[PDB]
Structure 1
Amino acid sequence: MPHAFKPGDLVFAKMKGYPHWPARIDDIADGAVKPPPNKYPIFFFGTHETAFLGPKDLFPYDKSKDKYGKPNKRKGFNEGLWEIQNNPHASYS
């Protein structure tokens, strides 16, 4: 049965106006900006941008990849599909 989201979990993350996007729950490093309550730091593969999102916008990768894991014309999308499948836990800093 599901647990709560934790750093390292792989997801498709949804934001207004964008397709469901390959992403991971990031850790928060000492000294880094913390998310708002009930929000998670989302790192988006491909773009390498961060946003804070709640669970309503977070779809677990294994369950969702058939549906959402298909090429997209949006900038960085296809690079992001490679990263989530091939090296989802690397430093992209």
Structure 2
Amino acid sequence: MPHAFKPGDLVFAKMKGYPHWPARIDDIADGAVKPPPNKYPIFFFGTHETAFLGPKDLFPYDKSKDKYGKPNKRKGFNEGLWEIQNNPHASYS
């Protein structure tokens, strides 16, 4: 059975106005700003942006890739597809 989301989990993450986006659950570094309650720090592949999202907006990548893992015109998206398939756990800092 599924567990709760944990750092390193791969997802498509949904934000208003944007297609379901390749992303990971990030760790919070020592001394870094923590997310709000019930929110997770989401790192978006390709754009390398971070937002805080709850589980309703998080789709596990393995289950969802056949539907959401297709090229998209939006800035950074196809880069993001490469990253989530080929080096999803790298430092993109």
Paired residues in the alignment total 93
Q: Where in structure 1 do 4 or more consecutive aligned residues deviate above 4 Å? A: none
Aligned-residue Cα RMSD (Å) equals 0.1
* 1:77 matches 2:84: no
Give distance in 2, aligned partners of 1:52 and 1:83.
20
Q: TM (normalized to structure 1)?
A: 1.00
* Aligned-pair identity (%): 100
* Post-superposition CA distance 1:41-90 (Å, at most 9, x none): 00000000000000000000000000000000000000000000000000
Give unpaired runs (5+ residues) of structure 2: none
Q: Normalized against structure 2, the TM-score is what? A: 1.00
Structure 1 gaps of 5+ residues are none
1:7-58 superposed Cα distances (whole Å, 9 cap, x missing partner): 0000000000000000000000000000000000000000000000000000
Secondary structure at the residue paired with 2:41?
strand
Cα distance between partner residues in 2 of 1:26 and 1:32: 12
